Amino acid sequence: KLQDSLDAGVGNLVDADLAKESAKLQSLQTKQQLGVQALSIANSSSSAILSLF
Amino acid sequence: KLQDSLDAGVGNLVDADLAKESAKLQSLQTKQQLGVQALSIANSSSSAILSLF
């Protein structure tokens, strides 16, 4: 019983809660796509000046 | 982040504002044409005297 409680305690110390990581994963994938889109918007600022010339 | 801020600072020091240069360019081209016309008017002053002779 002592060996089982030491192993369960190691699990309390280091194990991930995977049900919570699933939510973090989905939101982070959406954030990465929005960040690529925002960088694409920032890249195009120079093209606006071409119209004046 | 420090490298990006040093590069943005160099850009603040030396970069042109091209939207402002477009206005300066158009007005200067008009001024150059008017200056050629004014020099053409000044060139013709001698011809007025031919009428008296």
Swiss-Prot record, chains A, B:
Subcellular locations according to the entry: Secreted; Bacterial flagellum
Name of the protein described by the UniProt record: Flagellin FljN
Subunit: In C.crescentus, the flagellar filament is composed of multiple flagellins of 29 kDa; 27 kDa and 25 kDa.
Annotated function: Flagellin is the subunit protein which polymerizes to form the filaments of bacterial flagella.
Disulfide bonds listed in the record: none
Stretches that traverse the bilayer: none
Family designation: Belongs to the bacterial flagellin family.
Superkingdom per UniProt: Bacteria
